[PDB]
Design a protein around this nucleic acid. Sequence first.
DNA 1: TCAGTCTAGACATAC
DNA 2: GTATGTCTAGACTGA
Lengths: 124, 126
Amino acid sequence: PPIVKRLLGWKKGEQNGQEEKWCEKAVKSLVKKLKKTGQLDELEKAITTQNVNTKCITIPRSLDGRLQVSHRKGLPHVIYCRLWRWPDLHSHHELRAMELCEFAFNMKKDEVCVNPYHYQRVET
Amino acid sequence: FTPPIVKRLLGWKKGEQNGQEEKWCEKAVKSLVKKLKKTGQLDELEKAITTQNVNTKCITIPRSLDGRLQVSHRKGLPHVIYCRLWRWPDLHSHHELRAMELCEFAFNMKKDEVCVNPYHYQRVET
DNA sequence: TCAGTCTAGACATAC
DNA sequence: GTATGTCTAGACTGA
Ligand SMILES: [Zn+2]
Ligand SMILES: [Zn+2]
Protein backbone atom coordinates (compact mmCIF):
# COMPACT_ATOMS: atom_id res chain seq x y z
CA PRO A 1 0.00 0.00 0.00
CA PRO A 2 0.90 3.72 -0.56
CA ILE A 3 0.83 6.15 2.37
CA VAL A 4 1.14 3.17 4.70
CA LYS A 5 4.74 2.69 3.57
CA ARG A 6 5.45 6.39 3.93
CA LEU A 7 4.10 6.48 7.48
CA LEU A 8 5.98 3.24 8.07
CA GLY A 9 9.01 5.15 6.84
CA TRP A 10 8.80 6.98 10.15
CA LYS A 11 9.04 4.81 13.26
CA LYS A 12 11.78 3.57 15.53
CA GLY A 13 13.33 0.67 17.40
CA GLU A 14 13.38 -1.52 14.29
CA GLN A 15 11.59 -4.48 15.90
CA ASN A 16 11.17 -6.77 12.89
CA GLY A 17 9.93 -10.34 13.00
CA GLN A 18 6.21 -10.61 13.62
CA GLU A 19 6.33 -7.16 15.19
CA GLU A 20 7.20 -5.83 11.73
CA LYS A 21 4.09 -7.34 10.13
CA TRP A 22 2.02 -6.25 13.13
CA CYS A 23 3.23 -2.67 12.97
CA GLU A 24 2.10 -2.67 9.36
CA LYS A 25 -1.34 -4.01 10.24
CA ALA A 26 -1.67 -1.45 13.02
CA VAL A 27 -0.85 1.31 10.57
CA LYS A 28 -3.31 0.04 7.99
CA SER A 29 -6.08 -0.14 10.58
CA LEU A 30 -5.50 3.47 11.50
CA VAL A 31 -5.29 4.68 7.91
CA LYS A 32 -8.49 2.87 7.05
CA LYS A 33 -10.19 4.82 9.84
CA LEU A 34 -8.69 8.25 9.27
CA LYS A 35 -9.47 7.91 5.59
CA LYS A 36 -13.15 7.48 6.42
CA THR A 37 -13.15 10.63 8.55
CA GLY A 38 -10.82 12.53 6.22
CA GLN A 39 -8.05 13.01 8.79
CA LEU A 40 -5.30 11.13 6.97
CA ASP A 41 -3.62 14.34 5.80
CA GLU A 42 -3.37 15.88 9.28
CA LEU A 43 -1.80 12.63 10.48
CA GLU A 44 0.89 12.48 7.80
CA LYS A 45 1.46 16.15 8.55
CA ALA A 46 1.90 15.59 12.29
CA ILE A 47 4.23 12.65 11.73
CA THR A 48 6.48 14.42 9.20
CA THR A 49 6.66 17.83 10.90
CA GLN A 50 6.79 16.61 14.51
CA ASN A 51 4.68 19.71 15.09
CA VAL A 52 2.86 19.47 18.41
CA ASN A 53 0.41 22.31 17.78
CA THR A 54 -1.33 20.18 15.14
CA LYS A 55 -4.99 19.14 15.36
CA CYS A 56 -6.22 16.09 17.25
CA ILE A 57 -6.25 12.92 15.20
CA THR A 58 -9.26 10.99 16.42
CA ILE A 59 -10.44 7.39 16.50
CA PRO A 60 -13.61 6.04 18.20
CA ARG A 61 -13.06 4.81 21.75
CA SER A 62 -14.20 1.32 22.74
CA LEU A 63 -16.08 0.59 25.96
CA ASP A 64 -13.03 -0.69 27.85
CA GLY A 65 -10.77 1.69 25.95
CA ARG A 66 -8.65 -0.96 24.23
CA LEU A 67 -7.98 -1.45 20.55
CA GLN A 68 -7.23 -4.75 18.87
CA VAL A 69 -4.99 -5.07 15.85
CA SER A 70 -4.77 -8.66 14.64
CA HIS A 71 -4.77 -10.72 17.84
CA ARG A 72 -3.09 -8.21 20.11
CA LYS A 73 -4.91 -5.72 22.35
CA GLY A 74 -3.70 -2.38 23.72
CA LEU A 75 -4.49 1.27 24.40
CA PRO A 76 -4.52 3.29 21.11
CA HIS A 77 -2.42 6.24 22.23
CA VAL A 78 0.09 3.85 23.75
CA ILE A 79 0.25 1.85 20.51
CA TYR A 80 0.86 4.79 18.21
CA CYS A 81 3.20 6.77 20.50
CA ARG A 82 5.29 3.62 20.84
CA LEU A 83 5.17 3.38 17.06
CA TRP A 84 6.32 6.83 15.97
CA ARG A 85 7.95 8.09 19.20
CA TRP A 86 9.01 5.69 21.95
CA PRO A 87 9.58 2.05 20.89
CA ASP A 88 10.55 1.32 24.49
CA LEU A 89 7.32 2.78 25.92
CA HIS A 90 5.82 0.42 28.50
CA SER A 91 2.39 1.65 29.66
CA HIS A 92 -0.08 4.52 29.55
CA HIS A 93 1.27 5.55 32.96
CA GLU A 94 4.28 7.01 31.18
CA LEU A 95 2.02 9.15 29.00
CA ARG A 96 0.71 12.63 29.73
CA ALA A 97 -1.65 14.32 27.33
CA MET A 98 -0.83 17.98 26.89
CA GLU A 99 -3.47 20.61 27.63
CA LEU A 100 -4.06 21.48 23.97
CA CYS A 101 -5.29 17.93 23.38
CA GLU A 102 -9.10 17.86 23.60
CA PHE A 103 -9.69 14.15 23.09
CA ALA A 104 -6.97 12.85 25.38
CA PHE A 105 -7.54 9.22 26.31
CA ASN A 106 -7.56 10.38 29.94
CA MET A 107 -10.76 12.36 29.40
CA LYS A 108 -12.91 9.35 28.52
CA LYS A 109 -14.81 11.03 25.67
CA ASP A 110 -16.42 9.19 22.75
CA GLU A 111 -13.34 9.86 20.64
CA VAL A 112 -9.70 9.25 21.54
CA CYS A 113 -6.77 11.26 20.21
CA VAL A 114 -3.83 9.31 18.89
CA ASN A 115 -1.74 12.19 17.53
CA PRO A 116 1.63 10.99 18.84
CA TYR A 117 2.66 14.60 19.34
CA HIS A 118 -0.14 15.37 21.80
CA TYR A 119 1.45 13.37 24.59
CA GLN A 120 4.71 13.75 26.50
CA ARG A 121 6.50 10.85 28.17
CA VAL A 122 6.82 11.03 31.95
CA GLU A 123 9.96 9.72 33.60
CA THR A 124 7.43 8.40 36.14
CA PHE B 1 -8.09 -27.60 33.27
CA THR B 2 -10.22 -29.06 30.44
CA PRO B 3 -13.07 -31.11 32.08
CA PRO B 4 -12.85 -34.93 31.82
CA ILE B 5 -16.35 -34.89 30.26
CA VAL B 6 -14.63 -33.35 27.20
CA LYS B 7 -11.88 -35.98 27.32
CA ARG B 8 -14.45 -38.74 27.63
CA LEU B 9 -16.51 -37.35 24.74
CA LEU B 10 -13.37 -36.81 22.66
CA GLY B 11 -12.88 -40.54 22.98
CA TRP B 12 -15.77 -41.23 20.62
CA LYS B 13 -13.82 -40.29 17.49
CA LYS B 14 -11.26 -37.63 18.39
CA GLY B 15 -10.74 -36.46 14.82
CA GLU B 16 -8.50 -38.53 12.53
CA GLN B 17 -5.25 -37.19 13.97
CA ASN B 18 -3.19 -34.37 12.44
CA GLY B 19 -1.67 -32.69 15.48
CA GLN B 20 -3.28 -29.28 15.03
CA GLU B 21 -6.56 -30.79 13.88
CA GLU B 22 -6.61 -32.87 17.06
CA LYS B 23 -6.53 -29.74 19.19
CA TRP B 24 -9.29 -28.19 17.07
CA CYS B 25 -11.80 -30.96 17.77
CA GLU B 26 -11.05 -30.45 21.46
CA LYS B 27 -11.87 -26.75 21.11
CA ALA B 28 -15.03 -27.76 19.22
CA VAL B 29 -16.13 -30.10 22.01
CA LYS B 30 -15.13 -27.63 24.72
CA SER B 31 -17.35 -25.05 23.06
CA LEU B 32 -20.32 -27.40 22.76
CA VAL B 33 -20.03 -28.63 26.37
CA LYS B 34 -19.94 -25.11 27.78
CA LYS B 35 -23.24 -24.18 26.15
CA LEU B 36 -25.01 -27.41 27.09
CA LYS B 37 -23.78 -26.95 30.63
CA LYS B 38 -25.60 -23.62 30.87
CA THR B 39 -28.81 -25.18 29.55
CA GLY B 40 -28.40 -28.47 31.38
CA GLN B 41 -28.27 -30.63 28.25
CA LEU B 42 -24.84 -32.20 28.91
CA ASP B 43 -25.92 -35.61 30.19
CA GLU B 44 -28.30 -35.81 27.28
CA LEU B 45 -25.28 -35.35 24.96
CA GLU B 46 -23.23 -37.95 26.82
CA LYS B 47 -26.19 -40.32 26.45
CA ALA B 48 -26.71 -39.90 22.68
CA ILE B 49 -23.01 -40.11 21.84
CA THR B 50 -22.41 -43.21 24.01
CA THR B 51 -25.65 -45.10 23.37
CA GLN B 52 -26.01 -43.75 19.83
CA ASN B 53 -29.77 -43.97 20.40
CA VAL B 54 -31.65 -41.96 17.79
CA ASN B 55 -34.47 -41.71 20.34
CA THR B 56 -32.46 -39.31 22.45
CA LYS B 57 -33.88 -35.80 22.76
CA CYS B 58 -32.87 -32.82 20.64
CA ILE B 59 -29.60 -31.32 21.79
CA THR B 60 -30.05 -27.65 21.22
CA ILE B 61 -27.75 -24.75 20.53
CA PRO B 62 -28.70 -21.08 19.86
CA ARG B 63 -28.66 -20.22 16.18
CA SER B 64 -26.62 -17.22 15.10
CA LEU B 65 -27.73 -14.65 12.53
CA ASP B 66 -26.09 -16.35 9.52
CA GLY B 67 -26.44 -19.83 10.97
CA ARG B 68 -22.69 -20.38 11.09
CA LEU B 69 -20.68 -21.28 14.18
CA GLN B 70 -17.12 -20.25 14.80
CA VAL B 71 -14.78 -22.62 16.66
CA SER B 72 -11.23 -21.33 17.04
CA HIS B 73 -10.60 -19.66 13.69
CA ARG B 74 -12.88 -21.75 11.50
CA LYS B 75 -16.52 -21.19 10.70
CA GLY B 76 -19.06 -23.81 9.69
CA LEU B 77 -22.58 -25.15 10.13
CA PRO B 78 -23.23 -26.56 13.66
CA HIS B 79 -24.89 -29.84 12.71
CA VAL B 80 -22.27 -30.38 10.02
CA ILE B 81 -19.41 -29.88 12.47
CA TYR B 82 -20.69 -32.26 15.09
CA CYS B 83 -21.93 -34.96 12.71
CA ARG B 84 -18.50 -34.97 11.09
CA LEU B 85 -16.87 -35.13 14.51
CA TRP B 86 -18.80 -38.09 15.92
CA ARG B 87 -20.30 -39.86 12.90
CA TRP B 88 -18.99 -39.20 9.39
CA PRO B 89 -15.51 -37.60 9.24
CA ASP B 90 -15.98 -37.98 5.48
CA LEU B 91 -18.93 -35.54 5.58
CA HIS B 92 -18.50 -32.60 3.21
CA SER B 93 -21.46 -30.19 3.20
CA HIS B 94 -24.87 -29.79 4.85
CA HIS B 95 -26.46 -31.34 1.75
CA GLU B 96 -25.07 -34.81 2.46
CA LEU B 97 -27.39 -34.54 5.46
CA ARG B 98 -31.10 -34.77 6.26
CA ALA B 99 -32.93 -34.69 9.58
CA MET B 100 -35.15 -37.51 10.78
CA GLU B 101 -38.83 -36.74 11.20
CA LEU B 102 -38.74 -36.54 15.00
CA CYS B 103 -36.06 -33.90 15.26
CA GLU B 104 -37.93 -30.77 16.34
CA PHE B 105 -35.12 -28.28 15.73
CA ALA B 106 -33.30 -29.70 12.72
CA PHE B 107 -31.13 -27.11 10.99
CA ASN B 108 -33.38 -26.97 7.91
CA MET B 109 -36.37 -25.81 9.97
CA LYS B 110 -34.65 -22.56 10.87
CA LYS B 111 -35.80 -21.97 14.45
CA ASP B 112 -34.28 -20.00 17.33
CA GLU B 113 -32.54 -23.26 18.25
CA VAL B 114 -30.47 -25.76 16.29
CA CYS B 115 -30.22 -29.44 17.11
CA VAL B 116 -26.69 -30.75 16.96
CA ASN B 117 -27.62 -34.25 18.11
CA PRO B 118 -25.54 -36.24 15.63
CA TYR B 119 -28.08 -39.06 15.79
CA HIS B 120 -30.98 -36.94 14.52
CA TYR B 121 -29.53 -36.74 11.00
CA GLN B 122 -28.99 -39.21 8.20
CA ARG B 123 -26.36 -39.03 5.49
CA VAL B 124 -27.33 -38.97 1.82
CA GLU B 125 -25.28 -39.67 -1.33
CA THR B 126 -26.81 -36.49 -2.75
C1' DT C 1 -7.44 -4.22 38.40
C1' DC C 2 -4.84 -6.00 34.23
C1' DA C 3 -4.00 -8.81 30.32
C1' DG C 4 -5.19 -12.64 27.29
C1' DT C 5 -8.68 -15.71 24.97
C1' DC C 6 -12.87 -16.49 22.14
C1' DT C 7 -16.38 -15.60 18.64
C1' DA C 8 -21.05 -13.41 16.59
C1' DG C 9 -21.69 -9.93 13.75
C1' DA C 10 -20.18 -6.87 10.42
C1' DC C 11 -17.95 -6.72 6.08
C1' DA C 12 -16.56 -7.57 1.36
C1' DT C 13 -16.83 -10.78 -2.31
C1' DA C 14 -18.37 -13.99 -5.96
C1' DC C 15 -22.17 -16.75 -8.19
C1' DG D 1 -29.97 -15.57 -2.40
C1' DT D 2 -26.35 -18.78 -0.96
C1' DA D 3 -21.39 -19.56 0.23
C1' DT D 4 -17.13 -18.23 2.48
C1' DG D 5 -13.06 -15.96 4.48
C1' DT D 6 -11.11 -11.89 7.54
C1' DC D 7 -11.26 -8.81 11.36
C1' DT D 8 -12.28 -7.06 15.97
C1' DA D 9 -15.47 -4.99 20.06
C1' DG D 10 -17.37 -6.86 23.60
C1' DA D 11 -17.85 -10.75 26.54
C1' DC D 12 -15.44 -13.64 29.39
C1' DT D 13 -11.82 -15.36 32.51
C1' DG D 14 -8.25 -16.26 35.78
C1' DA D 15 -4.44 -14.19 38.57
ZN1 LIG E 1 -5.12 15.54 20.78
ZN1 LIG F 1 -32.99 -33.16 16.97
